[PDB]
Amino acid sequence: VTLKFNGLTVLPPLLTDEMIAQY
Amino acid sequence: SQSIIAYTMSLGAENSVAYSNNSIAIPINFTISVTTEILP
Ligand SMILES: *[C@@H]1O[C@H](CO)[C@@H](O)[C@H](O)[C@H]1NC(C)=O
């Protein structure tokens, strides 16, 4: 699974990619 | 003595499991549990 200025933000998820692994 | 506090969310009780090739559990009592579920 491969993957700034003008008011733009990518907020974090509530559950981290690690807590997904815990559930 | 109260305050606002920040923590890592507990995803559940850390629960241990009694596995074996020869062990089992089976129940003897039960709740006829009632739930509400509500939808637009
Ligand atoms: C069941 O598990 C024990 C180890 O906990 C082992 O010694 C035993 O041989 C196993 N029995 C069978 C039928 O697999």
Question: In the PDB record, what is the listed experimental method?
Answer: cryo-EM
Helix, strand, coil shares of chain A as percentages rounded to 5?
A: 25, 0, 75
B21 lines ligand 1 (CB under 6 A): yes
Beta carbons of B9 and A22 less than 8 Å apart: no
Going through chain B in order, the beta strands assigned E by DSSP cover none
- Give distance in angstroms: CA of B21 to centre of ligand 1: 6
Resolution in angstrom units: 4.3
Neighbours of A15 (CB within 10 A): 13
* In contact, B11 and A15? CB cutoff 8 Å: no
Neighbours of B15 (CB within 10 A): 5
Q: Which H or E run includes A22?
A: helix A17-22
Structure tokens at A20: 């997904």
Separation of alpha carbons A20 and A12, rounded Å: 13
Cβ-Cβ contacts under 8 Å, A22 against chain B: 11
